[PDB]
Amino acid sequence: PYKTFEVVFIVLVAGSLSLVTIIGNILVMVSIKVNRHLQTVNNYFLFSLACADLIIGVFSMNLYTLYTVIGYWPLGPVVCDLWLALDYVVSNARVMNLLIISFDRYFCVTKPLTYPVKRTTKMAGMMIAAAWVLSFILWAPAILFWQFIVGVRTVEDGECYIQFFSNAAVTFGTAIAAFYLPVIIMTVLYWHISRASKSRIADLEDNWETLNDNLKVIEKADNAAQVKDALTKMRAAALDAQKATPPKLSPEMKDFRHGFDILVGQIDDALKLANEGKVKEAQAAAEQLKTTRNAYIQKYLPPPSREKKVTRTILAILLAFIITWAPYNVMVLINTFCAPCIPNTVWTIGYWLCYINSTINPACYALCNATFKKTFKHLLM
């Protein structure tokens, strides 16, 4: 009845997903291989990840669409086991790749003196190569030759699944060792990445990125309530940052406190200028505010926190994987003891959620980066 338009919707949306995934990860790979500034170790890891996501976008998405649309596996047992081995090797390589990224960042933050000089491109490529090789050797022979190990192929004609995952014990231990334990590891690692990068001026200097981002908000405002809110928040950041001693430690130091003494005054001038709705006038006043700021940046401020945004990106990738892959693993755990508890619709949701992770990774690391955006504009134009 209604399932015809449902099928058309399925092939359209699925094809769109696959195409967007292919375009995104291909753009990442070409951008890294072309731009020399994108040839750092972080982008080596992101290159391996983009490769896995491209493999998922080219094969697994279209093969799963074929399975759901046709209602059974129409290609054959050889192709079925090839696709099972491929999906498993690629997922395991994804987990190990994310672990490599997490440990790399953790060592970069916890050993700032000894570790950075050891980070070379040869070590990065050697470790990602070891990751793919380990995943392949672990999963491929079992999935491809278990039928010959037991002397029988129990997979029915038209279906596609793994025989040795019939025992709930191997599914549970595999779920613990392959997903949950690595996720806990990544959580602790990122937690120490955040705690170790937290102390001193940075915590207190966050007020400065606060008045900066609020300045940018003032630039793109539309009414007096927006510049009022951002302006008061700027006043809070300036007042907390005023009684904050900079690292360079009265003569030429009353300069530092005098700069905030004038800054809060200009924030008051623009705030009373905003209480009656002079929006653009308050914005220009905020520009002169940015001039005074500029003076005191170039006078008494340490270098910016480029590594902190890197931590933000790491969190983006890890949260992408964890959030997108949690439902499927939960469905596996529940399926170990209650099969009718998980309908086929929600199974489909889990599958497409992992694949969607492969779709959204480039937006996590590449679309928020200035260099990747420059290379993208260069490649598309």
Ligand X SMILES: CCCN(CCC)C[C@@H]1CCCCN1CCNC(=O)N1c2ccccc2C(=O)Nc2cccnc21
- Chain residues binding ligand X by CB under 6 A are 83-84, 87-88, 91-92, 95, 171, 174-175, 178-179, 325, 328-329, 332, 351, 354
Min dist. Cβ of residue 94 to ligand X (A): 7
Which residues neighbour 85 within 8 Å (Cβ) at sequence distance 6 or greater? Answer: 139, 140, 143, 144
Dihedral, CA atoms, 124, 126, 128, 134, nearest 10 degrees?
-150
- Cα 263 from Cα 289, distance rounded (Å): 6
Q: Which is nearer to ligand X, 93 or 238 (CB)?
A: 93
Min dist. Cβ of residue 357 to ligand X (A): 8
Min dist. Cβ of residue 312 to ligand X (A): 24
Min dist. Cβ of residue 379 to ligand X (A): 29
Task: Annotate the chain with three-state secondary structure.
Answer: CCHHHHHHHHHHHHHHHHHHHHHHHHHHHHHHHHCCCCCCHHHHHHHHHHHHHHHHHHHHHHHHHHHHHHCCCCCCHHHHHHHHHHHHHHHHHHHHHHHHHHHHHHHHHHCCCCCHHHCCHHHHHHHHHHHHHHHHHHHHHHHHHHHHHCCCCCCCCCCCCCCHHHCHHHHHHHHHHHHHHHHHHHHHHHHHHHHHCCCCHHHHHHHHHHHHHHHHHHHCCCCHHHHHHHHHHHHHHHHHHHCCCCCCCCCCCHHHHHHHHHHHHHHHHHHHHHHCCCHHHHHHHHHHHHHHHHHHHHHHCCCCCHHHHHHHHHHHHHHHHHHHHHHHHHHHHHHCCCCCCCCHHHHHHHHHHHHHHHHHHHHHHCCCCHHHHHHHHHHHC
Min dist. Cβ of residue 123 to ligand X (A): 24
Would you put residue 338 in left (φ > 0), alpha (ψ -120 to 50) or beta?
beta
Q: Which is nearer to ligand X, 178 or 368 (CB)?
A: 178
Q: Which is nearer to ligand X, 106 or 325 (CB)?
A: 325
Min dist. Cβ of residue 225 to ligand X (A): 46
Min dist. Cβ of residue 24 to ligand X (A): 18
Q: Which is nearer to ligand X, 163 or 212 (CB)?
A: 163
Would you say 371 and 38 are in contact if contact means Cβ atoms under 8 Å apart?
yes
Min dist. Cβ of residue 91 to ligand X (A): 4
Q: Which is nearer to ligand X, 174 or 242 (CB)?
A: 174
Q: Which is nearer to ligand X, 139 or 376 (CB)?
A: 139
Min dist. Cβ of residue 188 to ligand X (A): 19
Q: Which is nearer to ligand X, 174 or 305 (CB)?
A: 174
Q: Which is nearer to ligand X, 84 or 285 (CB)?
A: 84
Q: Which is nearer to ligand X, 201 or 356 (CB)?
A: 356
Q: Which is nearer to ligand X, 187 or 275 (CB)?
A: 187
- Cα 236 from Cα 84, distance rounded (Å): 57
Min dist. Cβ of residue 172 to ligand X (A): 8
